Structures are given as C-alpha cells and as structure tokens.
C-alpha cells in the first residue's frame, strides 16, 4: 500500500530495530559456551544462553542444556557494532542476502573485528550477524495491548533497506 506520494519522511525513514549476533555450534565441540567470550568482546555486552525445544536426530538428547549463545543489541551499541561489522564482509555485494522484508544478515569469525585474539580463548567461524531494520511505528506490532500486525503500508522493503544502509559507510 506503500503511500510514499505526499510530503513524506521522518516517520517513514528506517531505523535499527536490533542487531542479533548469535552463535550456533553446541557444547563439547568447542566448549561450554566459551565463544561467549568472543561475543562478549565484539559486541561489548554479555551473551545469553540458548537452550533448544523440539527435534534432533543426531546427538543432542539433553534438550534443556547449553548449546548456543546470542547478543541482541540496539541503540548506539548496535550501530557501533555495525560500523566494525559493516566494514569486514567486503562490499558491494549484494541484493540476495537482503530479505524483501528489508532485513539483512551475514557470517564470519568473531575474530573479525578489532580485537584481540589474545583475549578470546576461542574464536569460532560462523553464525549470523543479523540486522533488523524497521520504521518508527513498529512499536504497534511489538507492544502488549493493541498489537496490530504491521501493514504492507509500514513494512520495510529491500529497496528501502538497501538504500538507507547504502546511504551509510559501506
């Protein structure tokens, strides 16, 4: 329903909902969740434990147990992450990783970034940095009481996404 043709912006322009940096490997294969250390450094705040629910067929009977780790960041902290993260995968590159929904994600070792290797006791190769982009009004699908779906009208587009991010430092 994209209504652009008016007299526009400041509510329309994109913002960062979140950056989630998530590891998926498992326990035992590298450790407890020790690339939490590496997350800890790159992002700047502590990652939180990922448990699983549902199926595996492959070892992974324990269910409730540590297997993964994540950092959902946002404000300045997400952006500050983007700046370092944004520059490492090369550019430019590419429409395919963007969804139509207007989010984009990439992989690489935590060791990419400025950072000491020396502090991370382990490095671990890859897992999604995910960037959630959205308009101001999101708060309607998010907030509890008066949830309303986000309309086609509101929802970010890959074109819109590429533009706002391509606007900045890549």
């Amino acid at each position: 329903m994209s209504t652009e043709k008016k007299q526009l912006n400041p509510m329309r322009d994109i913002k960062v909902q979140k950056l989630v940096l998530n590891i998926s490997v498992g326990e035992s294969g590298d450790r407890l969740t020790r690339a939490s250390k590496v997350l800890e450094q790159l992002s700047g705040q502590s990652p939180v434990f990922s448990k699983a629910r549902y199926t595996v067929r492959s070892f992974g009977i324990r269910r409730n147990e540590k297997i993964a780790c994540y950092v959902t960041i946002r404000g300045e902290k997400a952006m500050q992450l983007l700046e370092s993260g944004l520059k490492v995968k090369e550019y430019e590159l590419l429409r395919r990783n963007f969804s139509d929904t207007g989010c984009f994600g990439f992989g690489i070792q935590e060791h990419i970034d400025l950072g000491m290797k020396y502090d991370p006791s382990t490095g671990i190769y890859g897992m999604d940095f995910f960037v959630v982009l959205e308009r101001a009004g999101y708060r309607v699908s998010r907030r509890r009481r008066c949830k309303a779906r986000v309309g086609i009208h509101q929802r970010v587009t890959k074109e819109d996404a590429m533009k706002w991010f391509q606007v900045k430092y890549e």
Binding site: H111, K117, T122, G123, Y125
Partner: protein
C-alpha cells in the same frame, strides 16, 4: 595493579580463521601457520620487523596485525594471475600464497575440478583410487577401505 612491561598476558589468535597456536618462538610457531616452512618463517618476521625469539603469543597488538597482513600479502613479494583472461576453469592463479583455508577450499575446487572436465585425474577421484601413482603391490588401505575380510 601496577603496569609492568607486558601485563601477564597470553594470546589467542584466529589469524586465518578458527586457529589458535602458542608456547613456541614466533619463527617456529609461524611454521605451523597455515602458511609457512622453516624456510619462509624467518623471512616474514624480519620483514615485518619481528625477532626470532619473540613468541607470537607474547607480542603486542600491532606486531601481530603486521603478521596477519604480511603473510597473505607484502613488500618485494606479490603473486597475481595474469595471462590473457582466456582459459575458463582451473589455472593456478600464480602460486596461492595465501596458503591455508583458501588453499584447502581451492583444493576442493581442484578435486571437483578434474571430474567434470573428464580428465584421467578427475576420473580417478570419482573412483577413489590414489592419483599420483603408488606401489600397489600392497599398501593403500587408506585409499579405499580397511582390510576387508577375504574377497570373493
């Protein structure tokens, strides 16, 4: 605490990716380096401005940074394919050095290669037999399975 000339420290690299070496002198440690012989290792340190006896793990940040860049790419050395861009697939690109995960990754591209091309090399991989010639007379247990009871 009081700032003493090197912290306490110890260190974790990823360097290429995923890899964490230590205990060793830098020259000798680098040999590990998914990129070096004993021959290579001495060169990179002095060019980089790193001593022999300095362990790679004890070093300060910028000394390590210079390592990470110099190995894959550096001063009076280079490497570039060239010829006329003609040749499709596979080539050499000019001795990938480089080395390490890019080389293991290209070593797959190279396995995959021969096979579609339909050369005698590729044709051997599909079969699973060792490609650059052994005695055969015995030995090759590895090449396509364990000792497999009698036969028929």
């Amino acid at each position: 605490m009081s700032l003493i000339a090197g912290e306490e420290f110890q260190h974790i690299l990823r360097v290429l990716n995923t890899n964490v070496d230590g205990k060793q002198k830098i020259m000798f440690a680098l040999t590990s380096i998914k990129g070096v012989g004993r021959r290579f290792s001495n060169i990179v340190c002095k060019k980089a401005d790193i001593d022999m006896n300095k362990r790679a793990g004890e070093l300060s940040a910028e000394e390590m940074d210079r390592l990470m860049a110099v190995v894959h790419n550096p001063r009076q050395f280079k490497v570039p394919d060239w010829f006329l861009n003609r040749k499709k697939d596979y080539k050499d690109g000019r001795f990938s050095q480089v080395v390490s995960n890019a080389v293991d990754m290209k070593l797959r591209d190279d396995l995959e290669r021969l096979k579609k091309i339909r050369n005698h090399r590729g044709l051997r991989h599909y079969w699973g037999v060792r490609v650059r010639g052994q005695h055969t007379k015995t030995t090759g247990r590895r090449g396509k399975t364990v000792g497999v009871s009698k036969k028929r």
